[PDB]
């Protein structure tokens, strides 16, 4: 006859009914991802709308219970996830306008074409079309045209829509006892109610700006070396003191630097590590890929896979009689059902992908005992970290020689570790400032700190100072460059790509030190050792019942976030880079511009 008993009864009724609708909402989506057809295209919306209506009514009914009378942490955690109204607090016309804007922003981005109106051959799709001309081309004007013309059409019709979006979401967020939309987006990392592990929204910026200062050193030398190496391909467009042009980073915007490896190889005469020639010649197919990837997880002590993981899963492209969207997503149907759906091909990039997507099902298999509202990971940047450390331990020449992929006597020398370390560094270090500056820009523009006239000046003002990237042509206030990104047009968060990289090296160092390795960190492995698997599994069983600070301390021993393991991991390459960068000009200048004549 108390609030904490009525809440338990309400939660029991909610929990013992939603399991029968979420499973049917997932099954229709699985069938659609298998079949692109106009017949089943509306089952997605029907099942989603029924579930949202159930959730909307439950959220409306849950508002009658205050949070100041409940003492149980588990009950408070379950009830806090149900009282979040979302956009239901707005008026009807405003909600309809917000929905229209949201459904139009995606349509414009999806159906936006780029072509040259003067030459008929200068037309192509996006993937593998316009994304291919920006990947493997060594021309200047060919890239400049495709870089300028994409943001002159798609990035120019979204500016009024984004201006209305900002003012609509500010009013949406100010009605939920919040300050802005940025404060709404930082509510995931807020932990309260536990003494000694309290985290505030105002400390995330302080932590991130402190972690970036320790990192900047190494990125500065890496940028100097890359800029010195790029002088050979474009000798008349880059300054040896200034910054790097934006449209020469490897892709459309510059998030990843992976495609630049073919031009800046340190040792070009050594045979690179490769398994692509090792799985085609060995008659290795997608079935045996997973049959072999299972044993790596069994060796450390993890349970075995379920029976339905083989019969209901799709591994190969299902011909031309049906279309399947095979973007990388792991499928958890719930109610004891686990499947996969990937576009398998005989390449190295797909073997590590299979290991990564099997780590996901291994993680989801752990917390099945938690309730429906707590069957989730600790936070957003926490699920993607435990599935990435398994790929790092399988590409080393201690395991690739164990499964017969690599040569039995593939020599490990100082000329192969450098090649591996450069490839590892080009994909990890090059994106951290890119994520950081974009998130800082969003948080600064949502708070009203930047008025209308500097809506596009303070973009390049921070691009030219933090990441050291200049623009080829000037842009006035009419353009909207940031909205051209997929995650910005579809209003997705971005700091989960910054936290996971920091967490994944702490986890790896803790596990490998528990695994009793002696030597450099880039050669070790966790296989054939149960004391690392049983150390990780206790953390894997927690779910959302415990704060992320406690989950981090249960494994690493430090409730904060550190960069020291990452610096120790990349120290071997940094030592050689310091030696090789004696004659270069370490650092960049903010006064240089390619159009400043």
């Amino acid at each position: 006859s108390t609030i904490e008993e009525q809440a338990k009864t309400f939660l029991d009724k909610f929990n013992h009914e939603a399991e029968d609708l979420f499973y049917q909402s997932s099954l229709a989506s699985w069938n659609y991802n298998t079949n692109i057809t106009e017949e089943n295209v509306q089952n997605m919306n029907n099942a989603g709308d029924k579930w949202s209506a159930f959730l909307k009514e439950q959220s409306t009914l849950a508002q009658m219970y205050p949070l100041q009378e409940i003492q149980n942490l588990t009950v408070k955690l379950q009830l806090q996830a149900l009282q979040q109204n979302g956009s239901s607090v707005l008026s009807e016309d405003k909600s309809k306008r917000l929905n229209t804007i949201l459904n139009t922003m995606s349509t414009i981005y999806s159906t936006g074409k780029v072509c040259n109106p003067d030459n008929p051959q200068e037309c192509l799709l996006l993937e593998p079309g316009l994304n291919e001309i920006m990947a493997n081309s060594l021309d200047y004007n060919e890239r400049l045209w495709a870089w300028e013309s994409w943001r002159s059409e798609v990035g120019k019709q979204l500016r009024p829509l984004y201006e209305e979006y900002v003012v609509l979401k500010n009013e949406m967020a100010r009605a939920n006892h919040y300050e802005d939309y940025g404060d709404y987006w930082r509510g995931d990392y807020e932990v309260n109610g536990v003494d000694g592990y309290d985290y505030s929204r105002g400390q995330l910026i302080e932590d991130v700006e402190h972690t970036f200062e320790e990192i900047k050193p190494l990125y500065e030398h890496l940028h100097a070396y890359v800029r010195a190496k790029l002088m050979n391909a474009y000798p008349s467009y880059i300054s040896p003191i200034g910054c790097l042009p934006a449209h020469l980073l490897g892709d459309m915007w510059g998030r990843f630097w992976t495609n630049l490896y073919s031009l800046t190889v340190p040792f070009g005469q050594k045979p690179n590590i490769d398994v692509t020639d090792a799985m085609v010649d060995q008659a290795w197919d997608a079935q045996r890929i997973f049959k072999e990837a299972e044993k790596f997880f069994v060796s450390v002590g993890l349970p075995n896979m379920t029976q339905g993981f083989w019969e209901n899963s799709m591994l190969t492209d299902p011909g031309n009689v049906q279309k399947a969207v095979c973007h990388p997503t792991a499928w958890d149907l719930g109610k004891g059902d686990f499947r996969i759906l990937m576009c398998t091909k005989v390449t190295m990039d797909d073997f590590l992908t299979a290991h990564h997507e099997m780590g996901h099902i291994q993680y989801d298999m752990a917390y099945a005992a938690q309730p429906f509202l707590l069957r989730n990971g600790a936070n957003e940047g926490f699920h993607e970290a435990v599935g990435e450390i398994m790929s790092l331990s399988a590409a080393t020449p201690k395991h690739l020689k164990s499964i017969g992929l690599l040569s039995p006597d593939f020599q490990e020398d100082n000329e192969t570790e450098i090649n591996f370390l450069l490839k590892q560094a080009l994909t990890i270090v090059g994106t951290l400032p890119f994520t950081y500056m974009l998130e800082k820009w969003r948080w600064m523009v949502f708070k009203g700190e930047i008025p209308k006239d500097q809506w596009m000046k303070k973009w390049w003002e921070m691009k030219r100072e933090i990441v050291g990237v200049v623009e080829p042509v000037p842009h006035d206030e009419t353009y909207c460059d940031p909205a051209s990104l997929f995650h910005v047009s579809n209003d997705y968060s971005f700091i989960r790509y910054y936290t996971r990289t920091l967490y994944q090296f702490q986890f790896q160092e803790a596990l490998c030190q528990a695994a009793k390795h002696e030597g450099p960190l880039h050669k070790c492995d966790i296989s054939n050792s149960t004391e690392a698997g049983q150390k990780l599994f206790n953390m894997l069983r927690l779910g959302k019942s415990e704060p992320w600070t406690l989950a981090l301390e249960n494994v690493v021993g430090a409730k904060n976030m550190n960069v020291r393991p990452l610096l120790n991991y990349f120290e071997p390459l940094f030592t050689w880079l310091k030696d090789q960068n004696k004659n270069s000009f370490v650092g960049w200048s903010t006064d240089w511009s390619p159009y400043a004549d």
Binding site: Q6, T9, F10, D12, K13, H16, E19, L27, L61, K335
Partner: protein
């Protein structure tokens, strides 16, 4: 002598629900448990108080066949000394049970595509049941002191919830058809033994 009808209790085409579990009085028949161990289909065969070897040399006065359907991760609750949503609201085994619990997977016989919602169970009850007690009612549970005169509204809910049996659900949710053979010795003649 005749063959005791074990095919209608274990091989029935349609079973009952746990809240309204059926009860078949099987007595004055020749029960053969020797073919049960060799059936190679029982996913769970646990006997409390009695042994599988001693089941063919002892005769019980009454062999009551209580039959119902439960989940896979839930069969362990049907045992002396367990708690849950079923061991106190639907059917409680006494702590001094002297019978056996049988179960096997029947996903291919108790599941259809799109859903089979023909089995239900109790969810809300104001008290806890005594062992060996059945109560069938759809009365609305008053979770507070509003009160509620029958309308399923604020803090007043329907007690009966259904079972979502489908071909693709997990092993822990697959229908395990359970017949709880409740052997007991009374002051009446016993002639039920192999």
């Amino acid at each position: 002598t005749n063959l005791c009808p074990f095919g209608e209790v274990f091989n029935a085409t349609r079973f009952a629900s746990v809240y309204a579990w059926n009860r078949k009085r099987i007595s004055n028949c020749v029960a053969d448990y020797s073919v049960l161990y060799n059936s190679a289909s029982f996913s769970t065969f646990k006997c409390y108080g009695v042994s599988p070897t001693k089941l063919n040399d002892l005769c019980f006065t009454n062999v009551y066949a209580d039959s119902f359907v439960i989940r896979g991760d839930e069969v362990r609750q049907i045992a002396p000394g367990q708690t849950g949503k079923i061991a106190d609201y639907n059917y409680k085994l006494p702590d001094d049970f002297t019978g056996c619990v049988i179960a096997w997977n029947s996903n291919n016989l108790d599941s259809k595509v799109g859903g089979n919602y023909n089995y239900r169970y109790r969810l809300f009850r104001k008290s806890n049941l005594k062992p060996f007690e059945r109560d069938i009612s759809t009365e609305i549970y008053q979770a507070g002191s509003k009160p509620c005169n029958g309308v399923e509204g604020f803090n007043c809910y329907f007690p009966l919830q259904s079972y979502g049996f489908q071909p693709t659900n997990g092993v822990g949710y697959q229908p395990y058809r359970v017949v709880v053979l409740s052997f007991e010795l009374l002051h009446a003649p016993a002639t039920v033994c192999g």
